[PDB]
Design a protein around this nucleic acid. Structure first.
Lengths: 51, 67, 214, 187, 211, 124, 107, 51
RNA sequence: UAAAUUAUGGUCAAUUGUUAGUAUUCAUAUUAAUUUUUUUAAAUGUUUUAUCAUUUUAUAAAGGUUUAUUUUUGAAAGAUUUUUUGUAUAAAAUUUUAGGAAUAGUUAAUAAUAAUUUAUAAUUUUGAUUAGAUUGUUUUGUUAAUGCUAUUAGAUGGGUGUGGAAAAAUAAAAAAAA
């Protein structure tokens, strides 16, 4: 069953992250606020203890 | 190798792929590959120059040649 | 103040000379009014503006530029059952009757599909092809028999429409395990240009199915 | 950049604002300086140039005008870059100083191409010939002079570009002294 | 100090794209066909390396090798290249033969230029520089009459005259006083609107004293 | 080939002549590729085989000068252009001799006048 | 005041409120009554509580006891579900007989 | 296909589709069984893998 | 009504087995069978602790009927700390019945936790409610087939209000603080 089967050379000669297509993800403004605040808190987490 | 009562067949193409007559660029790629290709390659040609030792020659060509 | 135009008739502009019938034809009346409204114009097909002229020089040679006399061109009229269905039915009936010319409605899809039939060699030619209501198809026969054997719409009933994918186009090209340039399937692409399955498969696209013919 | 009270300027107002007296200055040299200043920008520098608190119709019209200006400047940037690339190519292939390359002629081109082809470099001779033929049409030190000057005048009319040509930290090329250059070549 | 380019997306499909078992082959081929290379010793050594490594070489490799030998005039290396091409039945190009002729002519090996412009003389459609090489080689030994003869040979062969050929042929006709031949050359030059070089201008001035 | 017969729409589906009659009727109605190609006006293999130059045969006939881009005088055949006509590995030795006059021949003002100079000095 | 704010998520109504406009349909008598008798009942209840506190205390004690000593006071997920009769259908009929139907709205 | 499935339309034919949906189903959606070309990359890196 | 323009000055074809894929047998397959085997008899030891106690140990079955859900931060993971602050509760959408009709601890508003209030409220012929059947379930089977057909992941308002969370009367074992 398909013992000898090959694929294009584009697959093996593509660069990294060439295939990613630009799609605009949409989310609610409440989601925007929630995620922005969460990311800001995570950035501001103080180092030393476990970070 | 074969077993009893199984009537094995023959596979004509290695894989299912588009023929090279269907495009000008596939045709050119096949023509270039054929010109870069041998027609009958023997134990003396370049691809076997890595069998530099008689023991390498014998072990490659005697058994496990399928491998 | 400003009043908006609702229907295609109002948008395209229509005198509505007749008393109350809103759907009256008006094509002829407008044609002769425009004609007497003029003789530097020839009876070759007209185009409303220059940049609309064909790209091919020989076709540009047949086409002429006329300001507003490029409209209402045509001699024949339009003779449920969507235009492709009716086109297939009329051509089949005329071919079985062994006629020469078949007057068939001229829409974007019908006209492109007739052009594709001409390209593949199933119709000898056309008459009044630049008409936007109906055009005549000059059918071709060879030794008493008709070139077209069967012609049928994709929507075998008049209702249900389909959307062919590129996999469908390749399916058609390799139908029944053969390479199939014999029977021609026509599809209208997302660019409103009508192609056969050979070109659709070559271009890796599909479209809305129109009909099959051979 | 954009300011709460910035506004577009007409011709009389531009002349009144830039009303200065001068007797001698090389238009070509100053234009080259201003164009190098423009070319040494990021696309961001064109961003906040529409004065706010301005009606939406005039705002959109100013947007078209400024986008046209930016596109013309970018086209001239590409043309100038290609012209300089061809200048370097000719100078490298022939060996002549790149300064005197701009005053050569077809006889000199013929002789140099003949020398290259004699030395066995047909592709290199073709490169030299193509570069010279392509450059005799685009190499005039003032090639699109009127277009360039009208573009600069349009920048002046916009009224939001007066401050983008100064206040740059430069270094003295010879003494290597870092300072702030306040001269305004655009002015 | 690295392969000029080596990786995905730089090599022809029909070879299988980039096979990492032949990176040395690809680098060697790029160095062989390096157009900016100007070291003829490097060219000979690279040809020997390719010979050992068994990479097929076309006429363009030999053309680059010969092109690298003209500025220093390693005419002997150029003749050895031609001998190897004769041995392997690899037909040289017009430009490669012209490079060999240029090396020999600038080296003053008029005998070798004469010999080379006899193996490819009738078969290959030689060109203006190939004929200029014979002109220069003959004028080197002082065969100005034979330089005029090779000028007529070029005329018969049909490859047109170029300003360098005009200058050299005019010099030959100036030293060996051929008023009619120089009249022919001047009329042809005026017809073809060539830029007259300083050497040709001096030859025509010297001849105008006679005629 | 493959054949399938439905007889459930007949009065007597058990009759013996029905299958043979149907097969022979279908074979009568079947047309050959040679006949189809002759009737359409084209070769038979172009309707069966996947060779890439067959794409040209499904399009209609168009003038060569109309398809290929025009020249300086207007429509010209693509075969009258030397570059179109000649392989690329031949235009380095003798092509250069031929076209030297094309690039490096002209009047004295054409050959000695530098065009690479200021063109607004007088108005400035 | 007819378009909400795409970035802030504000509705048509909030956009109009922030602009200081008023897009309100002419109300009928019953609608105006709905919007008017909100204050009268509040004032009546507050006055009752201020005027006679013995009865108010009695009623408040009744409410508080009826709630505190009541089943399903956990505020768990089952109690927090908005539409109990439809979210929990298998309970109705054979386990719970409070609701004789499983549908009371558009859902 | 629903929640987890990447399939976006039926394999061969579907009901009529409009606008971007028709454009995608006809041309732009991933067709992974294609034997001539693999799915197509974004604009700046399709050109350099065309061959 | 365009009227048959004389370069016929270039003929010498096709085939070399190289592939852009649902393919159709009304009787072969497909099931209970011609080939169906193999075992299975309950009565039961989780653990550590300061000891008549306290700490750790949250989805067994049958029945009843099943919306289409769930990140208790709250316990643990877990650390230079500290909260039972580390946003878990929401929505969209897809069901069946040969004899087809009414449904309701009811809809929205609310200064109303815990509604003495206000309204021309809400569900339904675009098929509701009840009753009957009834876990869902592109996984099964079959076919040339967008057809037909088949199914066991779960869940669980009165048994302690304990617990971070009821999932708590049974545990092929996921090793449970040396």
């Amino acid at each position: 069953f398909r013992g000898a089967d090959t694929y294009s050379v584009k697959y093996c000669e593509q660069g990294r992250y060439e295939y990613q297509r630009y799609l605009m993800i949409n989310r609610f403004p409440s989601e925007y606020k929630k995620h922005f605040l969460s990311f800001l808190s995570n950035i501001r987490m103080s180092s030393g203890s476990a970070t | 190798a074969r077993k009893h009562g199984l009537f094995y067949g023959k596979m004509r193409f290695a894989e299912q792929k588009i023929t090279f007559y269907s495009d000008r660029f596939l045709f050119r790629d096949l023509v270039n590959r054929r010109e870069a290709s041998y027609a009958n390659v023997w134990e003396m040609d370049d691809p076997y120059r890595f069998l530099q030792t008689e023991q390498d020659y014998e072990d490659y060509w005697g058994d496990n040649y399928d491998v | 103040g400003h009043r908006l135009l609702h229907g295609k008739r109002e948008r395209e502009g229509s005198l509505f000379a007749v008393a109350n019938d809103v759907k009256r034809d008006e094509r002829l009346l407008r044609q002769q009014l425009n004609a007497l409204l003029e003789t530097p114009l020839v009876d070759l097909p007209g185009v409303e503006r220059r940049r609309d002229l064909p790209a091919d020089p020989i076709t540009r040679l047949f086409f002429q530029h006329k300001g507003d006399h490029a409209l209402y061109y045509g001699t024949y009229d339009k003779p449920l059952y969507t235009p492709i269905y009716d086109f297939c039915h009329r051509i089949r009936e005329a071919t079985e009757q062994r006629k020469r010319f078949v007057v068939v409605p001229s829409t974007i899809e019908t006209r492109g599909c007739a052009r594709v039939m001409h390209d593949h060699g199933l119709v000898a030619g056309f008459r009044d092809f630049h008409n936007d209501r109906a055009f005549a198809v000059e059918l071709k026969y060879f030794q008493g028999d008709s070139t077209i054997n069967v012609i049928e719409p994709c929507s075998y009933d008049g209702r249900t429409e389909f959307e062919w994918s590129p996999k469908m186009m390749r399916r058609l090209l390799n139908t029944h395990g053969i390479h199939n340039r014999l029977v021609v399937y026509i599809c209208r692409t997302a660019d409103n240009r009508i192609i056969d399955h050979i070109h659709a498969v070559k271009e890796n696209i599909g479209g809305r199915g129109l009909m099959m013919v051979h | 950049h954009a300011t709460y009270g910035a506004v577009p300027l007409t011709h009389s107002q531009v002349t009144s604002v830039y009303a200065t007296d001068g007797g001698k200055v090389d238009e070509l040299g100053l234009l080259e300086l201003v164009e190098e200043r423009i070319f040494s920008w990021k696309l961001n520098k064109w961003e906040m140039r529409i004065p706010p608190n301005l009606p939406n119709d005039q705002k959109e019209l100013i947007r078209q005008e400024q986008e046209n200006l930016k596109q013309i400047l970018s086209g001239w940037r590409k043309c100038f870059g290609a012209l300089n690339a061809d200048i370097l190519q000719i100078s490298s292939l022939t060996g002549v100083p790149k300064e005197v390359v701009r005053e050569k002629n077809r006889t000199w081109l013929q002789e140099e191409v003949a020398k290259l082809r004699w030395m066995g470099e047909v592709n290199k001779a073709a490169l030299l010939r193509d570069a010279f033929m392509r450059l005799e049409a685009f190499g005039s030190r003032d090639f699109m002079f009127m277009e360039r000057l009208c573009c600069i005048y349009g920048l002046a009319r916009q009224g939001t570009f007066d401050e983008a040509f100064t206040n740059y930290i430069t270094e003295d090329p010879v003494t290597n002294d870092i300072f702030v250059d306040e001269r305004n070549p655009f002015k | 100090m690295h392969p000029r380019l080596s990786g995905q997306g730089v090599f022809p499909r029909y070879g299988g794209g980039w096979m990492h078992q032949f990176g040395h082959v690809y680098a060697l081929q790029q160095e062989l066909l390096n157009a900016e290379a100007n070291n003829w010793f490097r060219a000979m050594e690279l040809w020997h390396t390719a010979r050992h490594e068994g990479v097929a070489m076309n006429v363009s490799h030999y053309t680059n090798i010969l092109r690298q030998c003209v500025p220093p005039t390693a005419w002997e290396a150029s003749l050895m290249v031609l001998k190897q091409m004769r041995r392997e039945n690899i037909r040289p190009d017009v430009v490669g033969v012209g490079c060999a002729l240029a090396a020999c002519a600038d080296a003053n090996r008029s005998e070798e230029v004469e010999k080379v412009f006899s193996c490819f003389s009738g078969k290959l459609k030689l060109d203006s520089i190939c004929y200029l090489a014979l002109i220069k080689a003959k004028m080197s030994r002082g065969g100005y009459a034979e330089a005029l003869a090779v000028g007529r040979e070029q005329d018969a062969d049909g490859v047109p005259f170029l300003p360098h050929t005009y200058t050299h042929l005019l010099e030959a006709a100036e030293v060996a006083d051929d008023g009619e031949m120089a009249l022919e050359l001047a009329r042809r030059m005026s017809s073809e609107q060539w830029p007259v070089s300083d050497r040709g201008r001096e030859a025509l001035k010297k001849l105008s004293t006679r005629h | 080939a493959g054949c399938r017969i439905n007889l459930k729409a007949t009065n007597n589906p058990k009759s013996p002549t029905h299958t043979v009659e149907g097969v022979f009727e279908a074979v009568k109605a079947l047309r050959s590729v040679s006949e189809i190609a002759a009737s359409r006006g084209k070769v038979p293999h172009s309707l069966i085989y996947n060779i890439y130059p067959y794409l040209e045969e499904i399009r209609r006939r168009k003038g060569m000068m109309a398809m290929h881009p025009p020249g300086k005088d207007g429509l010209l055949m693509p075969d009258r252009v030397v570059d179109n006509r000649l392989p690329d590995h031949l235009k380095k030795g003798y092509y250069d001799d031929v076209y030297w006059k094309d690039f490096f021949a002209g009047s004295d003002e054409h050959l000695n006048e530098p065009r690479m100079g200021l063109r607004g000095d007088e108005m400035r | 005041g007819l378009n909400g704010c795409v970035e802030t998520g504000r509705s048509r109504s909030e956009v109009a409120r922030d602009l200081g406009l008023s897009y309100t349909r002419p109300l009928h008598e019953n609608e105006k009554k709905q919007l008017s008798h909100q204050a009268v009942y509040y004032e009546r209840l507050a006055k009752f509580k201020m005027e006679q506190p013995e009865a108010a205390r009695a009623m408040e004690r009744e409410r508080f006891v009826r709630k505190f000593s009541g089943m399903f006071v956990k505020m768990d997920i089952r109690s927090g579900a908005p539409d109990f009769p439809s979210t929990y259908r298998r309970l109705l009929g054979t386990k719970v007989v409070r609701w004789a139907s499983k549908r009371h709205g558009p859902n | 296909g629903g929640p987890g499935s990447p399939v976006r339309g039926p394999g061969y034919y579907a009901p009529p589709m409009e606008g971007e949906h028709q454009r995608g189903y006809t041309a732009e959606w991933r067709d992974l069984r294609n034997p001539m070309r693999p799915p197509e990359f974004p604009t700046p890196w399709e050109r350099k893998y065309r061959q």
